[PDB]
Amino acid sequence: EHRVLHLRDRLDLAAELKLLCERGPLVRIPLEDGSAVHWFALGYDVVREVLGSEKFDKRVIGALPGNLLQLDPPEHTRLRRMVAPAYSVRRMQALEPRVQAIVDDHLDTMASTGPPVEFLREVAGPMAARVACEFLGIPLDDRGELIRLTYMRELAARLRRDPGDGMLGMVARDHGADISDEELAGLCAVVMNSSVEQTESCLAAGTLLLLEHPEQFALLRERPELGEQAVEEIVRYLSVFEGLDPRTATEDVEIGGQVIKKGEAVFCSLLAANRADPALDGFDITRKESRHVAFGHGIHHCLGAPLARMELRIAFTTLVSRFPSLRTAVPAEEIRFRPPSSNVFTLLELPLTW
Ligand code: HEM
């Protein structure tokens, strides 16, 4: 439902979706059957206003333990507080060199296998999955099978008995009794499944985006210090996480000048908020600060953004440096993108040569 919020022209918005955004940053959508009233939050400020408000929950409208996205306060707060330290700046700094080496491992395989390569399946996917295992602290003997399968309750209970390194070891060590096997397995699942999906798509589609702007491909090679800026601009432009689960108002609340009634559901379009403003939409990695909501906002703000930002920075900076002659093996116009859907936005394959 609301398929219009996912209509794209390759990487850009479809004219049908652009026309919808012209109806204002907040659009009232009464269902034809009269069963409910829905809202589209299409603007940067409105999306942030909706997602920051405490007067919305994430009820199901007309469930896995450890899935933070399906919890509201106070239970959401309880679980997020236990896992949040795994993403501290000190955690990411200690992890960076090991992530760099994993990225280098996969670009080593790439340069040795020789061209061409299907970048999505053969590089981006394995890279994101391997970085995920390292962050989680998966034992090396389990990573091969854990990746192929994406068992979990079995893996979670065992690691919980003998806590090791990574996020799962930290949680089990500091909150052993407060988190169950199923909840710990759920934390690991979200990281290995949706998180990898979104990260691998940024790696692949982001590479294509850089290739379609060769002046910036080289610029990031000349000036690797733009990496952090480039990541923000890439996730903004891609918007692989296009739309969010509905937020239902728990009471009458005024948003963007209009009154959202209790019980009405609001659908935030990160795609539209990140891309609808033609002024300053061009892809430009020299932008020192991007206006985007690709990682969400509020209490549900992407808990893995620190890892995602670091992994993508390392991946893109090392890629342009080790493969300055990189190019699509087919005309970029022939790349296939997944048809509109609530699923993560991604291309179907990315054949590359160099
Ligand atoms: C390092 C890889 C990633 C990890 C570990 C990760 C972990 C999560 C977690 C734990 C949540 C739940 C937050 C909560 O409800 O409290 C989440 C939701 C989200 N993630 Fe991912 N994520 C990852 C890659 C991404 C990337 C690359 C993006 C950017 C497109 C992303 C955009 C989101 C957004 C926007 C939400 C919030 C959805 C909503 O508000 O309904 N994530 N992620």
Author numbering: 5 to 66, 75 to 162, 181 to 384
Article sentences:
Cytochrome P450 enzymes (P450s) are a superfamily of monooxygenases that utilize a cysteine thiolate–ligated heme moiety to perform a wide range of demanding oxidative transformations. Within GPA biosynthesis, P450s function in a specific, stepwise manner to install the essential side-chain crosslinks in the core peptide in a process that typically requires one Oxy enzyme per crosslink to be installed. Given the apparent preference for the unusual heme orientation shown by OxyA enzymes, we investigated the OxyA homolog from kistamicin biosynthesis (OxyAkis), which is an atypical GPA. Structural and biochemical analysis of OxyAkis has shown that this P450 enzyme is highly prone to oxidation and can display an atypical heme orientation in different protein batches.
With the general fold essentially unchanged, we performed a detailed analysis of the active site of this P450, which revealed a mixed population of heme orientations as seen in the Fo–Fc difference map electron density at the substituent vinyl and methyl groups. However, even once the density of the methyl/vinyl groups was well-explained by a mixture of heme orientations; there was still evidence for additional density at the side of the heme immediately below the I-helix (β-position). To explore the possibility of radiation damage to the heme due to long data collection causing this modification, we collected several datasets using an attenuated beam. Even with a beam attenuation of 95% and collecting data in small wedges to reduce possible damage, this dataset still showed density in the difference map for modification at the β-position of the heme.
